[PDB]
Design a protein around this ligand. Structure first.
Ligand SMILES: *[C@@](C)(CO)[C@](*)(O)[C@H](Cc1ccccc1)NC(=O)[C@H](Cc1ccc(OC)cc1)NC(=O)[C@H](C)NC(=O)CN1CCOCC1
Ligand SMILES: *[C@@](C)(CO)[C@](*)(O)[C@H](Cc1ccccc1)NC(=O)[C@H](Cc1ccc(OC)cc1)NC(=O)[C@H](C)NC(=O)CN1CCOCC1
Ligand SMILES: *[C@@](C)(CO)[C@](*)(O)[C@H](Cc1ccccc1)NC(=O)[C@H](Cc1ccc(OC)cc1)NC(=O)[C@H](C)NC(=O)CN1CCOCC1
Ligand SMILES: *[C@@](C)(CO)[C@](*)(O)[C@H](Cc1ccccc1)NC(=O)[C@H](Cc1ccc(OC)cc1)NC(=O)[C@H](C)NC(=O)CN1CCOCC1
Ligand SMILES: [Mg+2]
Ligand SMILES: [Mg+2]
Ligand SMILES: [Mg+2]
Lengths: 222, 212, 222, 225, 195, 196, 204, 195, 196
């Protein structure tokens, strides 16, 4: 029997700072035990300072990104070139995803950008459209490896102030873009070590009020 | 999930956990399971996150359209029945929802309606919904009186979620509290189980099963 | 896994990668897939990891007892005969796929065995999930009358093909060279082309970070 | 929901400094029966694109008709049909990619793996894959079926990343492709000896080679076994 | 079968076990005692598959009684629980396993301490302050997490137990026809007749 | 597989391709499907590689023990041992074996043993997946009391066609010639047989 | 009805400078229902420590079995079993039940008393030995543990620093798994002293 | 849902319907009224699939009320029962049938007679002196076969009904949390509050 | 079935057996599997009797309507109509059809259409269950530009072998000769072909 779904592997990761946000994703594309491409980007600039990635089944991922990019275009046409805010993008994507509730897009979706107060924003979706804003989210094949590391290093979970008898928590603070990129690079090198579908290259899209910047790094190719 | 809402002398208490799961994978610990429909209506979410989140936000839009068309806030009965009639149309399709529509109106007073995805709609004073509903019931039933004070009712609701958060593997994160009065709903904070458990254990002397 | 075996002038060489997997997860990044049956008979094993190790040890044990009984150096065909009759008896339920090679008084030999108990003969062979990547290289570059240093190069190149192109293979290249008239030389981590890069950050925690409820000295003495 | 009947095996390809090369054997298999031997699985669109198709042949012939029709439709009311408004490889691909994904979404797929090889109007090399699932990807080397497992490893030894492309000549590239075709004939049970090969170069244009044969094969060592 | 509870307090173990025996759409009996005395200071309640439950309980009972006669000595609750666990641990890999879940309430006379052990049909043993088998636990554990204190009296334990039965009678789907309650302490085993 | 054994004036010749498959992947392109169970009793193996190997090994053992006690076994005897194993273990075997041997009294003989474990003595036999495609050709071309060169051509042309149509067959054409003169191994490469 | 994920639980082991650490959670449940928060999964036979995740009845059974076997070993050998030897004993015993296995994920940890070398090892349910320089992981949150260990771990940590690393690896991994947590225990093991610490963690 | 009974006596129809609403291992409600008044002298009880029951009951209720307003006239119990049967008879061959079983108790004012109709989800209608749906019938029918007389009073009918509820509470596996009893006669519909 | 169509110097000849089966029972031993879709365009039918009949009837209708408007259709056109039906209804059809016709410009032409609905233009085609057994024979014996008598013998000998080995084939060998001269029907009985 024909199976309409497939698994193209890879993993993605979004972190939000005070006045910026990053959306990273490895560039490896796979089926079963074969590598299709060592450089196939899945993190996209969609306009209006919104970066997006839909990781899982690449055909559904590309379809969704394509539809959302198109949604941004028509939002401009219909509402006098108004900027699509990240919260409005999020709600719009929910309807895209839930529209196929009974034949789902097989993808974990993450978008990043800046909210209307200029602060960094990351939104994450399940395959059928439930969404939530967070400081932090890893998605895709190695999400289960990276996410607990992020809980510990971004949100300082399980970390207490030394000498306070485990009574005072380590206080929350925003991370600099330098610090965030260190965590992203360490997250992906760790994920590359222990997950077979993750590797080849890392592409990070950084979003500030000045626009979208890119950074590329090599990952292990085994 | 564990969600509850009960009626009492001073109105309605609504309490929910904040965990989201995908199998045994803890997907989130900070999810909002109460949706504020209007200043007098609340909806609780249990079951499929997308199903709940999508259709209860949609419910909010229908309630807004009612008050525009009828120049009057929708009744809790009518609001719950919009949702129940909707999910009944999808009966068999595989929607998964256990919801509670809580609110106050003049004609009804404080009212709670249980609505689920197989089309069950029930008016009642106490309900617990979700995978940890039984754990919440155990504590809530055994401490419930109609004459509870607002302070005590808030704590019991909080303590019942904590009970379930602890025992049910698929509940946890934090407790979100709400109090519904004749004047509308009032938010009573997010309470992380990470700190709340030890605070309750110490102060209350309960949870003796746990290594102190 | 990826494993290979290549015959040359005065003997035979086998090689293997060093990745062990659990589904998509890399369990062991440097496991030893090259097994010693007797001093000059070595096995490369793919398939169920516990089965390859257990079947190689059992036949290795029985080969040592046989060698002591007959006052003779063991033969590769004896190991081959014992392995195949054991594996056949279990109808493929023991998932051991082996490349058996070595030198004995009869000469130098190279065989493969499948889980159901069928055996092959050849000058070059490859088994495991990365056997197609390896065999592609072997079919491209192999020739009659290879030297020792040529065969090692060909073998390790065939393993490298698996390492880079097969997700089930990675990390390092182990090699064993069995030459007639000489001791077998096991070359553990003969190539290490997948060294982890320096991490961006030290995650050494301030002492006291972890909240503790109880301490106690554990008695290990009598 | 389908099952493939008459099928074609591997399609292999790679980029080189001035263009792309693509190849596929001339066999139409009917299960284990090697039924048809005169099947052409490389289909040129214009003078700048070749589409290589594996999988179900009835669906391949349908796709042929679609591409043929696309050329006709593009010529309509188009004075620059043989110039600036000629069909680009990127247009042909995106059209096929759309169709493949739409058919999978209707649970009635075209049972194929497809590689679109060509050269764009600005001289850039185009090489991209699409299959029955609508999955698309691009790489310096691309291959379908057994080619993915056996050809890609060999072709990647020549062009392992983007920077290796300018360093690779058409002679070196074609040599690798022809070698890969031989390896597939050794090891793929549904391959034939006869094959076609196409070169799309930004200077010399489209060169279509028919009736090629795998040769310089090593079989002599078999007598010793 | 269905409902079996257990609470360990300061000086005793209290076992509550449902009285109903249902088969199909008929409650065949409403006075069934789902327990066996293994030794003078050790009691075992049981629930699970029909036939298996009593067959297993009586088989364990016979063995412990045999031991008692042989050595002229009472095995500790810990020792009895370990014996029972091993029998179940064997059983689970038999041709037809015993589908029986048990609670073992005992008073260790050497330690002067009450002890409660929960063992499922797989042979999964745990010592607990309070225990339950089947769907009962889904209500009682959270309830006891709240109201239980380790220093309670037998009377306090019975009131705590009444609270559990009331909750079950309110929220459980099936009529389990009340419970038989038994207390295990330094003076042995006795049954509460008015519950 | 495509295998065949053909009796002729001076004895019998066995023939086989050299392809072994695991799905559509060729695990071994230089296989030897012609195996020796005795000096001048050989068999062609088709079906499961593991099953046919295990059977051939047991038969070779039985005939070696037979020879130790009673001298050279007949070809019929060898086929009977194959049958006994194939018939009694029919539920657990996938083996199509052709047995071919040379006596001096009986000359060349061919026995075929299909899946069920039945025995059939024939002038010539064909078996394996690729045999289906040459039933027509072989029936039309086979003649009794052919010469060595004619039989070699008959087998070469037959297996050439079987190999051409069957995807499960290919590589080289191995042959084994059984006569009073002795045992002769022949091999024929693609470049020769493909263009027949 | 997947035997390895009915009860839940996790074990992790790490090596440091002249020391080893082995840690485990305390949860025992029946699918969603948490039953016990005192269920320790680490045992020791002399100076050799063994952690076992998986089906709890088999955890208990194997502990009892290896106590049995190491006691007879010591009586006959007149010495304590070493980690390398015990690792082999575990592997043999598990593979003995090849076609009716114990549904477990054991982890050996200890210091060889003769050589002074830190040693850790892991196994699948069927006996495959997985030796490591750095860390071994096991249980229902093994993916999480793999991610935590791979990023947090560095070689040659001092006993006090190693404690922080392994604890943070376990805690943050457990909090992303529904079936793991409910308390934790860490063993720090030096050549001739062993410290056991109970960790404070969230109880949901 | 689960237990719905009906008894027709000399001058009235008496419907008893269980109060429990159970879902999974939780009794969500113990005061549920499983009935709708279709017209002043016609009452319908219902049991079956969750959601379907109330959705069907209210749909029938709306239609009968619509008829009453249109014609300024009350349909006879026989006419209402025939309408309901046909709706179910349509439903059973729909894409998703209503899985609802009903009893219709009515007082025909033209005939001055009580009438009880039992209709299952297939659209199988029968007029009866006493009726039951689901497992209840397996106990109550034989009981009523013995104790029922056609000339009984409403009080005698209630005592006869108490006998049925007692038997069900004794032998039924599930706790159905008692019944709500309603009487249909010449003066319309009224609820007995103390049962 | 066993069916075949063979082009030759003067045009093309179609050939078929006459067996129809329902399991191992022969429902009709004198079937006519060679059917007319146009004056000089014929087809051989294999697979489902009902499916191939329904297809042939629709094609005959389409070509009759084609002829009314545009004159005589080409053989290629006829094959395209067959393909269209077979390809678009591939899920609900079990039909293996060989299309053969005679033009004066194009002479003899043969198109084969297998299960999937693909089209293949060949010098000669074989199809049906019994074709498997004669791939070897037909490849070895077919020559281009044969005479009428040679082609008749080629088909007769081929189908004779197919019939001999295939249980699903038998009865008489029907043939239809398509040339510029016209249409000629030939029949050959068991007593002749069996002893070839
Ligand atoms: C507790 C945690 C038990 O799940 C709650 O019921 C919780 C409720 C909730 C509501 C709103 C927002 C957050 C949380 N439910 C979940 O977290 C829910 C559990 C669930 C999974 C699958 C279901 O389908 C049968 C039903 C309930 N988790 C999810 O929905 C997760 C995030 N997403 C998926 O499992 C994606 N699935 C959904 C169904 O379609 C296929 C893809
Ligand atoms: C490559 C890595 C496979 O991708 C090799 O074949 C490798 C060979 C090998 C040999 C000796 C030592 C290490 C590695 N095989 C594995 O790594 C093997 C993969 C595998 C497992 C099971 C299979 O089904 C028969 C097939 C392949 N890995 C293991 O066996 C690991 C160590 N153990 C487990 O996965 C145990 N699981 C099995 C499923 O049940 C739960 C526990
Ligand atoms: C031709 C090539 C196709 O069958 C021959 O029959 C050939 C005969 C042969 C091969 C080598 C040595 C002597 C004789 N058979 C195979 O190559 C055989 C194909 C086959 C597999 C399984 C069968 O049923 C059990 C029947 C035929 N290939 C193999 O045995 C290979 C080595 N193994 C597998 O494919 C693994 N099998 C094991 C049995 O279960 C299915 C998977
Ligand atoms: C040879 C004899 C064997 O297939 C031919 O293919 C022959 C072709 C033919 C016969 C008459 C007229 C023109 C052409 N086919 C049959 O005789 C055919 C066998 C067949 C049956 C079903 C098939 O799949 C649907 C494929 C082939 N016989 C029939 O059609 C007979 C008349 N009917 C049945 O056997 C009843 N079938 C109906 C379809 O479902 C299975 C039962
Ligand atoms: Mg790799
Ligand atoms: Mg919890
Ligand atoms: Mg016949």
């Amino acid at each position: 029997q024909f199976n309409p779904y497939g698994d193209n592997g890879g993993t993605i990761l979004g972190i939000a700072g005070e006045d910026f946000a990053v959306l990273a994703g490895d560039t490896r594309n796979i089926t079963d035990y074969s590598i299709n491409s060592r450089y196939e980007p899945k993190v996209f600039d969609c306009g209006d300072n919104i970066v997006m990635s839909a990781n899982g089944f690449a055909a559904d991922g590309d379809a969704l990104v394509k539809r959302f990019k198109n949604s941004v275009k028509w939002y401009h046409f219909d509402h006098n070139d108004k900027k699509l805010s990240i919260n409005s993008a999020a709600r719009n994507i929910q309807h895209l995803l839930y529209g196929k509730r009974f034949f789902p897009y097989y993808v974990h979706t993450i978008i990043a950008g800046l909210d209307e107060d200029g602060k960094g924003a990351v939104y994450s979706f399940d395959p059928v459209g439930s969404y939530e804003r967070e400081q932090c989210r890893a998605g895709g094949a190695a999400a289960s490896l990276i996410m607990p590391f992020l809980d510990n290093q971004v949100n300082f979970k399980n970390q207490y102030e030394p000498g306070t008898n485990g009574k005072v928590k380590k206080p929350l603070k925003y991370l600099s873009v330098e610090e965030v990129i260190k965590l992203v690079r360490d997250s992906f090198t760790s994920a590359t070590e222990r997950h077979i579908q993750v590797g080849d290259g890392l592409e990070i899209l950084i979003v500030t009020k000045d626009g979208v910047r890119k950074e590329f790094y090599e990952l292990k190719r085994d | 999930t564990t969600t509850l809402a009960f009626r009492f002398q001073g109105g309605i208490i609504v309490a929910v956990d904040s965990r989201a799961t995908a199998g045994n994978w803890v997907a989130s610990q900070t999810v909002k399971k109460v949706i504020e429909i209007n200043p007098f209506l609340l909806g609780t979410m249990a079951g499929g996150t997308a199903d709940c989140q999508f259709w209860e936000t949609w419910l909010g839009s229908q309630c807004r359209l009612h008050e525009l068309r009828e120049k009057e806030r929708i009744s809790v009965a009518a609001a719950s029945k919009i949702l129940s009639n909707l999910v009944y149309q999808y009966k068999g399709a595989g929607l998964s929802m256990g919801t509670m529509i809580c609110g106050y109106t003049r004609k009804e007073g404080p009212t709670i309606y249980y609505v689920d995805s197989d089309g069950t709609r029930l008016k009642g004073d106490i309900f617990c919904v979700g995978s940890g509903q039984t754990f919440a019931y155990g504590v809530l039933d055994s401490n419930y009186k109609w004459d509870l004070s607002v302070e005590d009712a808030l704590y019991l609701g909080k303590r019942s979620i904590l009970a379930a958060a602890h025992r049910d593997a698929y509940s946890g994160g934090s407790v979100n509290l709400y109090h519904v009065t004749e004047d509308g709903w009032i938010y009573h904070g997010n309470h992380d189980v990470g700190e709340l458990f030890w605070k309750v254990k110490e102060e209350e002397g309960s949870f003796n099963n746990v290594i102190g | 896994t990826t494993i290979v075996g290549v015959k040359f002038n005065n003997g035979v060489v086998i090689a293997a990668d060093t990745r062990s997997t659990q589904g998509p997860i890399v369990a062991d990044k440097n496991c030893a897939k090259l097994h010693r049956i007797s001093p000059k008979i070595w096995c490369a094993g793919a398939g169920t990891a516990a089965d390859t190790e257990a079947v190689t040890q059992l036949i290795g044990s029985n080969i040592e007892l046989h060698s002591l009984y007959t006052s003779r150096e063991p033969r590769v065909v004896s190991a081959l005969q014992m392995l195949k009759q054991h594996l056949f008896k279990y109808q493929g339920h023991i998932g051991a796929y082996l490349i058996v090679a070595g030198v004995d008084p009869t000469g130098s030999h190279l065989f493969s065995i499948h889980a159901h108990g069928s055996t092959d003969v050849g000058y070059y062979l490859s088994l495991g999930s990365g056997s197609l990547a390896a065999m592609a290289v072997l079919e491209s570059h192999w020739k009659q009358d290879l030297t020792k240093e040529e065969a090692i190069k060909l073998a390790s190149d065939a393993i490298q093909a698996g390492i880079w192109n097969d997700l089930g293979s990675g990390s390092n290249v182990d090699v064993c060279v069995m030459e007639i008239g000489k001791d077998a030389e096991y070359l553990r981590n003969y190539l290490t082309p997948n060294v982890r890069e320096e991490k961006q950050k030290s995650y050494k925690f301030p002492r006291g970070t972890t909240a503790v409820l109880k301490e106690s000295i554990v008695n290990i003495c009598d | 929901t389908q099952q493939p009947i008459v099928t074609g095996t591997s399609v292999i390809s790679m980029k080189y400094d001035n263009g792309v090369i693509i190849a596929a054997d001339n066999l139409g298999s009917y299960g284990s029966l090697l039924r048809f031997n005169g099947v052409e699985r490389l289909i040129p669109v214009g003078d700048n694109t070749v589409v290589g198709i594996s999988g179900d042949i009835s669906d391949m012939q349908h796709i042929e008709r679609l591409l043929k029709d696309l050329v006709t439709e593009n010529a309509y009311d188009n004075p620059l049909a043989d110039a600036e408004e000629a069909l680009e490889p990127s247009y042909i691909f995106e059209y096929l990619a759309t169709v493949m994904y739409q058919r999978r979404s209707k649970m009635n797929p075209l049972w194929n793996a497809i590689i679109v090889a060509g050269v764009q109007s600005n001289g850039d090399q185009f090489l991209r894959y699409v299959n029955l699932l609508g999955v698309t990807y691009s790489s310096p080397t691309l291959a379908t079926g057994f080619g993915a497992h056996m050809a890609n490893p060999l072709l990647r030894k020549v062009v392992d990343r983007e920077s290796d492309i300018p360093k690779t000549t058409v002679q070196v590239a074609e040599e690798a492709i022809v070698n890969a075709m031989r390896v597939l004939y050794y090891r793929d049970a549904r391959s034939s000896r006869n094959f076609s090969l196409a070169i799309i170069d930004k200077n010399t244009g489209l060169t279509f080679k028919k009736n090629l044969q795998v040769e310089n094969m090593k079989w002599d060592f078999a007598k010793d076994i | 079968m269905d409902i079996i509870l257990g609470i360990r307090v300061q000086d005793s173990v209290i076992l509550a076990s449902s009285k109903a025996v249902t088969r199909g759409i008929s409650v065949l009996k409403d006075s069934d005692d789902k327990t066996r005395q293994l030794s003078p200071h050790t009691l075992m309640s049981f629930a699970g598959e029909a036939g298996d439950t009593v067959q297993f309980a009586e088989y364990i009972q016979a063995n412990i009684q045999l031991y008692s006669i042989r050595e002229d000595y009472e095995l500790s609750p810990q020792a009895v629980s370990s014996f029972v666990r091993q029998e179940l641990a064997k059983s689970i890999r038999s041709r037809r396993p015993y589908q029986v879940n048990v609670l073992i309430g005992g008073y260790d006379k050497k330690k002067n301490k009450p002890e409660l052990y929960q063992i499922d049909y797989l042979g999964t043993k745990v010592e607990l302050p309070y225990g339950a088998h089947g769907y009962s636990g889904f209500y009682t554990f959270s309830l006891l997490d709240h109201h239980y204190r380790p220093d309670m009296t037998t009377e306090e334990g019975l009131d705590l137990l009444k609270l559990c039965v009331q909750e079950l009678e309110k929220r459980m789907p099936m009529d389990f026809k009340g419970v038989i309650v038994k207390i295990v302490d330094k003076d042995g085993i006795r049954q509460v007749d008015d519950f | 597989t495509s295998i065949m054994a053909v009796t002729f004036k001076d004895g019998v010749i066995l023939g086989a391709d050299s392809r072994t498959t695991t799905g559509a992947y060729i695990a071994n392109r230089v296989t030897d499907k012609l195996t020796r169970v005795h000096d001048k009793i050989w068999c062609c193996r088709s079906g499961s590689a593991a099953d046919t190997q295990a059977i051939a090994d047991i038969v070779q053992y039985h005939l070696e023990l037979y020879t130790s006690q009673y001298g050279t076994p007949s070809t019929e005897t060898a086929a009977s041992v194959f049958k006994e194993l194939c018939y009694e273990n029919k539920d657990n075997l996938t083996a199509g074996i052709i047995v071919a041997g040379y006596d001096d009294k009986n000359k060349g003989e061919v026995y075929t043993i299909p899946l069920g474990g039945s025995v059939h003595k024939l002038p010539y036999a064909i078996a394996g997946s690729g045999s289906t495609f040459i039933y027509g050709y072989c029936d039309k071309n086979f003649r009794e009391n052919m010469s060595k060169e004619e039989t070699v051509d008959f087998i070469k042309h037959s297996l050439s066609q079987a190999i051409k149509w069957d995807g499960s067959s290919g590589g080289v054409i191995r042959m084994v010639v059984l006569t009073a003169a002795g045992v002769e191994r022949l091999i024929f490469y693609p470049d020769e047989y493909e263009q027949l | 009805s997947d035997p390895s994920s009915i009860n839940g639980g996790i074990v992790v082991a790490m090596t440091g400078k002249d020391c080893v650490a082995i840690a485990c959670d305390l949860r025992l449940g029946s699918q969603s229902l948490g039953v016990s928060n005192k269920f320790e999964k680490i045992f020791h036979y002399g100076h050799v420590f063994l952690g076992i995740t998986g089906l709890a009845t088999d955890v208990t059974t194997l502990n009892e079995m290896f106590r049995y076997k190491t006691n007879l070993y010591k009586l006959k050998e007149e010495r304590a079993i070493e980690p390398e030897t015990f690792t082999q004993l575990v592997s043999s015993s598990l593979y003995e039940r090849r076609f009716g296995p114990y549904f477990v994920g054991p982890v050996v940890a200890g210091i060889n008393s003769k050589s002074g070398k830190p040693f850790i090892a892991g196994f699948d349910l069927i006996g495959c030995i997985d030796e490591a320089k750095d860390f071994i992981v096991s249980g229902t949150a093994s993916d999480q543990l793999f991610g935590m260990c791979e990023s947090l771990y560095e070689p040659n940590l001092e006993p006090e620093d190693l404690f922080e690393t392994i604890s943070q690896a376990l805690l943050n991994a457990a909090d992303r798994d529904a079936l793991s947590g409910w308390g934790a225990v860490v063993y720090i093991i030096k050549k001739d002293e062993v410290v056991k610490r109970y960790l404070k963690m969230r109880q949901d």
